[PDB]
Structures are given as structure tokens and as C-alpha cells.
Amino acid sequence: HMFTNVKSTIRRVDPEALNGRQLLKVVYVVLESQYQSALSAAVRNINRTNSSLAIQLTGYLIEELPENYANFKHDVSEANLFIASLIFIEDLADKVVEAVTPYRDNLDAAIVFPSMPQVMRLNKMGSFSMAQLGFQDAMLKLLRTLPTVLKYLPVEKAQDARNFMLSFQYWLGGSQENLENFLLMLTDKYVYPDLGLDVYPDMGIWHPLSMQMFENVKDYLEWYNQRPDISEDLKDPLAPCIGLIMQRTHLVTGDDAHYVGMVQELEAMGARVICVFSGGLDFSKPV
């Protein structure tokens, strides 16, 4: 209900003035009205602040797809990015794949979040698709499965799968800045690599399944023991614990696929992991 949920009459967000900036075109089809507003807010903010990038955003709720569907096919055809989430309607879903599949090569990226498997097969990020894989709980299911996939892939394809995991984590975050990083990450790595689109402590503790860095052991272990996706054996103080040392730069870049695979492998073997990083060259400090 509109009385208890703020809804918007606006489907389309255009930049006021393109200027000398590159134009990213995004098309979404979604169920949750909250992600509609969050995407729009993220796009309007980027358009008013970024001096080298502007974004055009067109979207529809799944039911709205009948006039709108004609514009949908056309918007998809010109789109750099296609996004879909929570699409569970038989004829509606089929209409989506029919409109996307022709331009699946034209799209720099196609990101489908937990929907009908027919829609899920539209996923394409670089070399990564819904192949190579070996409500809120459904997103955690797929999320935690992604690190387990990395090892069976070559390095370059592993990073694509990681970028997928990364954009997935941003989405679940759902904040305006989360979605901003989402779009900017997708743009820098798959749409305009030469645009140079580019809070982190000097040193700290990192885990791929955590969106925040930890600046002390206490906070980290506290978070570690609250994890529902790990065996109780991992939380036991008598469990084998391996420390990993890595460069901070690969974490701030997002090129950490092999780091993520290393963490997953150790955990899979029943080892608790403590990954430290530093931006400097004295790694004795984190140790």
C-alpha cells in the first residue's frame, strides 16, 4: 500500500546535461519497489556529481510488461547494462528472455538476481554466465556458493565470477552508495575501462563474506562466530587457524579472486582464517 510504502510514478531517469561525459544506459526489471527508488537515487546522484560519467536509467516493474513492452525491447537494445531481480511469473519471464537474448552479446553485462531459472540464464558478466557453476535466504544461498566456484575456473574467468559476487553483495546491501558502487564497478570493468573511474584503513582484517573491514581481532571473531554458513567446528578455539597476509590494493581494486578462493579452500578443510592486509610495506604490523 502507498500509505505504508513510498512509491514513485517515475520509471525513467535521464541526465539533465550530458556535457563531455560518457553515457551509460541501464535497463532494469524488478519486483521490490525499494530497489526501484534506490537505483534511481544512485543514478541521480552520479549524474549530479560525476564529471566523466552520466547514466540513463529506464525501468519497469514486472507486471507493467502493452505499450511498455515495446519501449522495453527498444531500451534493452540500446542498453549497456541489464538488471533483473525477483522475477517469478511464467509469461512475463518468457517475455523478458525473448527481449534480452538477441542483444545478449550487445550488452556489456546482464545481471539477473534470484528469479525463475529461465531469467537466470540471461546472466552474463565477461566470461561468466550461469554455467561454470560446478527470499533473503535465497540470495544468501547463491552468494555463499560463489566462492566455492572460483577454484574450478581459470584466473581471468574467476575474477568475472568474483565481480558477479561483488555486484551481488552490493545489491543485497541496497543502500544508495551500495548501488552507486555497483553501477560504477560494472562501468569501469565492462563498459568504459579507459575512463579511469577508479573507506579503507592502513591495515586490518578482511573476509570476502563481510562488506566491512575489521580493525581488531575481537570484532572479527565476534562476526566470525555469528556466521550461520559455517560448521561449529570452525568456531571452536581448538580448530586449525591459518593467517593469510595480502596487499590492501587488491581489496580496494576488487581483483581478489584468488584470495577469495584461498579463503574458501581453507574453510572447506575446516580451518578458521584470519586475512590481514596493509597498504604499506611493513607487514609485521598486521602480524
Added chain:
Amino acid sequence: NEYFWDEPLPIVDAVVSLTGFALVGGPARQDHPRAIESLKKLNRPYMCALPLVFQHPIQVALQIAIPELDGAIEPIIIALQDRLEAIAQRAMKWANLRKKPKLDKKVAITVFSFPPDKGNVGTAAYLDVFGSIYEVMKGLQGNGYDVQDLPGSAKELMEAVIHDAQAQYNSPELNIAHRMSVEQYERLTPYSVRLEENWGKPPGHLNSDGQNLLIYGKEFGNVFIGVQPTFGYEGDPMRLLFSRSASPHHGFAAYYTYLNHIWKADAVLHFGTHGSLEFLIGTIPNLYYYAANNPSEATIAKRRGYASTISYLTPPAENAGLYKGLQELNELIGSYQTLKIQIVNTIMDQARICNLDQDVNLPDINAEEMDQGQRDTIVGSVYRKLMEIESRLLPCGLHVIGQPPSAEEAIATLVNIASLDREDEGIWALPTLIAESIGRNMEEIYRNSDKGILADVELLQDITLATRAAVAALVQEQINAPWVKSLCDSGYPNVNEEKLKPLFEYLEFCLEQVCADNEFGGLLQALEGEYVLPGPGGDPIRNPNVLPTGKNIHALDPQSIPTLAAVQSAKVVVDRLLERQRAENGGNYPETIASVLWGTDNIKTYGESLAQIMWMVGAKPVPDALGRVNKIELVPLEELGRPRIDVVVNCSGVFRDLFINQMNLLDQAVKLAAEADEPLEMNFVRKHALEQAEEMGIGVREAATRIFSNASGSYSSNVNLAVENSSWEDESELQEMYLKRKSFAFNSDNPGMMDQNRDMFERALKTADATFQNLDSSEISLTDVSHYFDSDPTKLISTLRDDGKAPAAYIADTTTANAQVRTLSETVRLDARTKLLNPKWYEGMLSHGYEGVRELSKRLVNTMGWSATAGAVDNWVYEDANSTFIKDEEMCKRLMDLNPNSFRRMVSTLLEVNGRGYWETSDENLERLQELYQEVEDRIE
């Protein structure tokens, strides 16, 4: 700490940061105390220049505010030359303040607008100018500066600068310190030619003479007291509404040429008396004595005058008290009590005599046919209005720099400090504790006191007196070097003594800061080439951290507001505003409210008035993890409990300069509201925007443009200038100028482009049902400055509306724990009763002599402004003003002798309000005024 030192000693005379960041940053949140501690040890002039200079108005506004918290001086405001030379030369001159011996230092001190004639009155400085200058001169002399021929007194000082100021035997004439020729002028000032567009070739009427340009002032050794009578100027702002642009006359430019290239001053001291209407000073270090209660205008000086803004306390505030008819009524109400019919009839009669019938509902019904409550609530409501007048805490006098208040004359300031809850420091207000001791809520008493409930109105006064006696007990005991005994002697022995402890521990700490004498110390450190401690503005009562004074004051991080407390306090005010609007006009909600946003009160309250507007539209600020407020969201109608209300927001130029990021947030919220998929009867923003979009042929979002201000670089609607120059024919002129100057629309989808949109401005204003502003403080109130009426669209909306209906006008006051949403007229009456027409107030002012009369006319001129912009001044205000100041022959003579120029202003003002139809009075009064104008005209001319 490593490379600027060697007990080691500093190897640097001045520091210029080019980083643009806080001295001590991190990931994230700047650390200012650790930066201040470091910069104090080094003890050098700290200057910062943003790297943006060497090449998004929001990015600039956010960045520039940070080094100011470090106490930084800004040496900067197609080739690199001018910027590089500007920073280098100012760094040198600042450094030269250390390398140069104390007996060779030349300190210039410029005074603005003497004698006080026309033009803009300026700000509410509350400064005894010549009294303060005199203290500065003696302080310099008694510290090792070459002050030759130091006059015997402050009166003797003014006499030396303004010959025959009081116009006893000859006409007032300014001391000419120098006569530079046209040759010397055009040679030393390269920009002289650019001024010839409005003033022609030098010299040209202003500051003549006729062949030479006049440099008014007088030298006293190595200290020069100069005078800038006119900027160039106010003087009919209608002359600048078209092709003509603003430029200072040759005389004004010639003055700073004298200080730069002839007298060769090493430092210049200004006074923050004319604020934003002040903007040639050069590369010489620029010092200001700015009021501590005015951080907003202090930062404009920082950013437009390369200034270091040392603060001074405003005069020790006193309770306004009651007088004459108001006193007799207080005594009448006083009993009652023991007399408990006939008295209520006479209480109602005297209340009508005091014109309080327009502040409290006084029926034509006799008391004999009323209930017990109907009589209790009548006398209770009249009484609460009397106590509002009596307890209003405001300065009654001028401040002399270097002369702090005594412990005695600080109790009133202290009692209000004690009347405010403070979760961190973690103490409660005395009234709440006293109220808790008898099982009561202090705000339940407040709310009941507003309703006129005698039992609660009296209880409020009792708790007030108990508080007003307990704090004085702590002060008295401090003097001879007890407050619990006072609470028992007041009748509250069950007060939590555990909580009494940190409260009075806090109050005693505050007392030392109020009475601290660091004001002249700050000037010395600046002149010595040392590092002056930075501090926050502005309101000492709400934030005692503003004390002690003598610091280089700043505003705040524009991303730190609104605070959670601010947004909560804002909802209360809005709910109060809407309740009062529904009643007496509905009870329908208004569809559109026109508001003004000032930077000053938003600094002092941490974004309350700002947060009010967000709440009106049904939106909330969203702080990030770091606590930065840079996002905004709509709130569901379920949470709002009422329709979203349309807004027209008039942001001052100063607000635009300091808080453009908040304008960005507001515009986002308003447009979100207009796009909301909600029924039109629930969303007045969308209701109007849809209609406007069709009629204008645009989109809903563009039609939802509601955030306006002056064009960049401009300030005020210039209505204040026109009122201060009497240079307008009718109200339509003023309103025309308002629509021209104030219709620049902010665009959150294109922040750099603020274009004029008079069409939108009018369409939005047409829908306004109410007008709304927030009162800054009691010191800066509706009649103390001219800016309030300058931004007031009340009458404008009347002429814009098709039905010609005048909007209801309201003014919110949150300066005490008892938040009030008064009407505009109610507030104007409150100003009149507590300041202009109050013996305690005007006698206090007059006890300073010459400059005291200036304060009187200021309050009167601003009152006239309200007649022109809103017609919110009751006739008895002018009639009583004319009574006490002009009919009294004794007072009339006292005024004219003390200050001919300011007295002349009072006369013409009273003469003007009648001439334009705002004041109706007997011809005997008009004849006397008309004569007195001539008598004083002859004395001066």
C-alpha cells in the same frame, strides 16, 4: 611537528597548507583537537588554500569549511600569476608580523559608517565602537606599541576623529588625515579606471574637497584610526536593478590605497558591524572583531576578506522586566490569590490598556457571567504573556572590548544556561529537576502554561523563581571566595542532589568562561604573528563552548547537520505551526508554506529550521556510517499522519554560501514528494506540481522547483537598502525588486546552474497560505537587524494571489526550552515591549551616549521595514515611540544633544511611517516632528 621544528624552536614564520584537507585527517573524520594542539605549539599563522583554486559549488562549500575548523586563514578567494602572487604576498606580510619589532609595527583600525546617517544600519554588533577602540589603543601602548598622543577617554577619542560630533557649536566634521591628489590616486590604484563607470573621473562629489580625495581619520603614532563613512553604497538599490552595476566610489578605494601604499600599515583591524554589506583591502593581514553570536557572517568575512575573526562577548543579558502599565497589571494579577469577580473585570481592562487584547483572547463578556475556570484561564493567559515579556533574556547595552561581565551581571545568562537539558554533558536542566521533585513534566507545565491554566502558569513562575534564586546562590558563594538551601527556601527539598552536583559543577565552569578576559589577548597574538585559537559560534546559552571569547570563531561542518535532536525538535515546531494554522483559518491544513532559511540559526541549532522544511514535505535526512548527512528520503504517509505540505523556500545568500549542500538535499526531497504515487489530497506538493507542469508545459519534477536564493555573489533582496534610504515610491517597487533578486532557482539535477526562474517563483508563491521564519535569538531578533523583513514575502504573496488574500505570518522561537510559534505581529509586539519601548532597554543603550542613540533608531527603522513588507506593526508601537522619545521634551532634548545624526533618523522614520500610511496620529505630533527635523537639520547642515 618533525620538519618545522629543531628545547627545540620553530624554524618557520608562517605556514601555508596547500592540501585543502584538515590538518589531521584519517579514515575518516577530521581530528581538530589534535590539530589545534599541534598548531598551538608551533604558534604560527596557519593559512590554507584549496587546490581547487589552481584550476561543482557543492564540493567547494564542503571543502572550504574544514580548514576553518583548524583556525586557518584564507589567502585566496587564466594564468597562475595572480593566485600565486596573492598567496605568497599574504604569507610574507603575515610572516612579517614576527620579524618586525613591536615598536615599528603600524596597526590601522578602520571604522564604518560614522557619523551614523543613512545607508545600511549593518548587523546587531552590540558594540561600543569608540569605547572599544580606546581600550585597544591603551592595550597596545601598555604592551610596547608606539601609540603617541593617546587621548584621555573614549569621548575624547571620538572628538579627535569626529570634530563636534554632538553638534554643539559647529556642524559635525570628520578629521581629515590626508589629502591625496588625483595624480597620486590613479598612480597607486590601478583599478581606479574601472570605478569611473559609475563615478566618473576623480574625485567626484564623494570624499571631496574637489581636487583631492579625502582620507578621513587621525594618526596616533604607529596606530591610525580611520573612518569609512560610506561604502558606495546603499543609496537607492533601484539604480542597480538594470544596466548599472555596483562599485565603490573613488573615496572608498582611496582609503585602502592610503593604508597600503602611503601609511604602509602592517596590519588592519575591522569590526564586524556591517556584515555581508561590506563586500581592495590588499595583502595586508586583515583582522576582525566579530560578535561570538554571529558565526555565519564571520565565515563570510573569512572567505571574502582573507580575515581572521576574533570574537567578543555580547553585553550581559538581563531579563526585560515589566514597566509602567505592564507593571500595574502584574500587580493587579498578583491578587487575585487572596482576593479570591470585580478584579477580573479590571484585569481585563488594564490588559486592553496595555494592548494585550491582541495577544490574548479578551471577550466583551463581563466576569460576573463566567465560570471559575473561565476567570482562572483569562487571568492565567494574560499572566503568561506578562511573564513572557518579563523573562525575555536580552542585552540592554553595548559591549566594550576587553571589559568582561562581573559575576553578578552574569546570573541571568547563567540561569538560562541552567534551564536546558544536556545529554552529554549528561546533566538535566534545573527546572526539570525541580519539576521532577514534585512529580511533574516540565513540558507538560509548558504546554499547560500556553493554554492559560492558572495553576500551571503560576507553577511555571514559581519554578522559574526557584531556579532564578538557586543559581544566584552559587554565584554569590563564588563571589566571596548553599544553592540547595535556596531550593529548600523556595519549597523543593526533594530535589535529586546527585544530579544537582554535576549541574552546578557545570554552571560554575561556565561562569569563569563568561567572565574570562581573553578578547584583547586574541588581538595581540594575531598582531604578534602567533596562532589564534579557533572556536565555535554562536549562541552561548545553547552552547557554552562558544565561551570564552577572544577566539578565531568558525561555523560548522555543513555535513554535520541536521542532528537527530534537531529533526525531532523540528517536528514539534512544525506540528505546532500547523495546529495554529488549522485553527483560526480552517481547520484545514495549509497547502503551501513560504519559509526563509538563515545560516545563522541553523548553525546555532544544528539544523532545526532546515529540518522543519524537510518534515513539512515528509522527508528525513539519512546520515552515512561516518555520520555525514548527504542523503535524504521520503517518509511514508503513515509516519507523517498528515498530507505532505508544499513549500517555497527562500534561502539567504549566506545560507547558500555555507550550506548549498542542504539546498541540494531540500530540492531532492521536494521533487521526490512531487513524484510520489500518492492521492493529490495527501500530497499538496504533487497537487500543485501537476497543475503547474500542465500550465507551463513542462515535467512534474521541473515544475516542483521550490528552492530559491539570490544569484551567486549576491545577498539580500535589497528591500533593506531601499527601506534604509527611503528611496521607494510604493510597495509594488519593493516587491518587484524582490521578485527580480530572489528568484534564482537551485537545481539538484544541475547544481552549478542556478538560473533565474521568476515564472516558477511567482506560481509557487501564489499558492502560499502561510509565511514562516525562525528567530535566531533574542539579541538578533526581528527589529535588531534588517534581514528578516528583507526576505519577508508576506505582502508580496497578497499581490500575487488571485484572491488577494494575505497569508498568515508566523515566527518560531526555540531559544528556550519553551518553544513558541508566535505570529509575526505577536513577535513584533514582543520586540517593541522588550526593547524599543522598554525603559530598561533604551536607558541601558543611552547610558553609552552617542552610539546609544544609533541603537534606538536601528530598532525603529527595522520596525518601519515590517510595515512595508507585511504591515505587521500595530499603530500603538509608533504612537508610544513618538510619546517616550519625542513628546517628552526632556528625552527629546537629551537625544538630540547626544547624537544629532541618529536623532534625525528617528524623526524622519516616524515622519515616514505616517507619510506612507502606516502611522495614524494627531497633527500636533506631526507638526512637532516636522519642526524637530528642521532644528536638527540646521545643526548638522
